[model samples]
Target: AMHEFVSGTPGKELPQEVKDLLPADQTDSTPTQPSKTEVKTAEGTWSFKSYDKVHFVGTWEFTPAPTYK
Candidate 1:
């Protein structure tokens, strides 16, 4: 599996898809802190953490593919 780092502020810089999946309560103007808030999908899993009140950091872990021999 491969992972990439992503960071954004809620309701402002977060992706629409991510915003939609985030807890409804956390998507508001006064977002709450979340630790390792994971959202799973067919494409990948997004694990998020809030270090600051308005900023969130996360990892996008993509599914690994088997190597062809």
Candidate 2:
């Protein structure tokens, strides 16, 4: 399924479908963490700049492929 969202730059409302995927109400959000985010996992290092109660709209900065042969 294709999804839509407001690209980077804060103060944007998350689409209804996007909000549906979240555990919290999109209308209610905390500043506990900046809208920007960064994550690292076995999958790879990722950068998510925009964040809200519903959607995390950003780009994947890097995903290093396995170098092991």
Candidate 3:
């Protein structure tokens, strides 16, 4: 199986198709609203305030994890 990462400005609602891509336990369900999960974004309020917009980057910034392969 392959792992994936999706992101947006903090608090942005993830779309349904994207939600389905996650493991069930990784997401929450709701009766009147779509299920949701919060991703910790690389771009936060400080960056937004500094750059005037949210900036997203590829996840490769971090060094490898022994378990990733």
Candidate 4:
């Protein structure tokens, strides 16, 4: 599955299939911790953070991959 994000229009509705896969209501779950520790580089230390949800805001296109014989 491919995911894309769009800006500007927040009122638009997504496809029924996509909506079905989403949760009916938001949950109060806490943010998950990063899988790895921060890494130090020449510039600075890179840190990772987990997000609860991602709002899909673009048209979805499903292209079946070609089969090999």
Which is the leading candidate under TM-score? 1
Stretches of model 1 off by over 4 angstroms after superposition: 1-17, 21-31, 34-36, 53-69
**TM-score, per-candidate, Cα-based:** 0.34, 0.29, 0.21, 0.23
After TM-score superposition, what is the CA distance of residue 69 in candidate 3 from its true location, in Å?
Answer: 44
- Candidate 2, residues 1-69, lDDT tens digits: the string is 122234242433333333333333235323233233444455444444443433443322444446777
Write down the lDDT that model 4 would get: 0.32
Q: Which structure is stronger by lDDT: 2 or 4?
A: 2
Query: Residue pairs in steric clash, candidate 1?
Result: none
Instruction: Write candidate 1's Cα lDDT for 1-69 as tens digits.
Output: 112234443333344455554432344334433334665554444556543334433433333234569
Q: What shift in Å separates residue 55 of candidate 1 from its native position after superposition?
A: 7.2
Could you give me the TM-score of model 4 versus the true structure? 0.23
Off by over 4 Å in 2: 1-23, 27-36, 51-62, 65-69
- Ranked by lDDT from best down, the candidates are 1, 2, 4, 3
As a TM-score, model 3 comes out at 0.21
Alpha-carbon shift of residue 29 in model 2 (angstroms): 9.2
TM-score order of candidates, top first: 1, 2, 4, 3
Per-candidate count of clashing residue pairs (backbone under 3 Å): 0, 0, 0, 0
Per-residue lDDT tens digits for candidate 3, residues 1-69, read 222334333544434344453432223222121133322234321111111112212111121223434
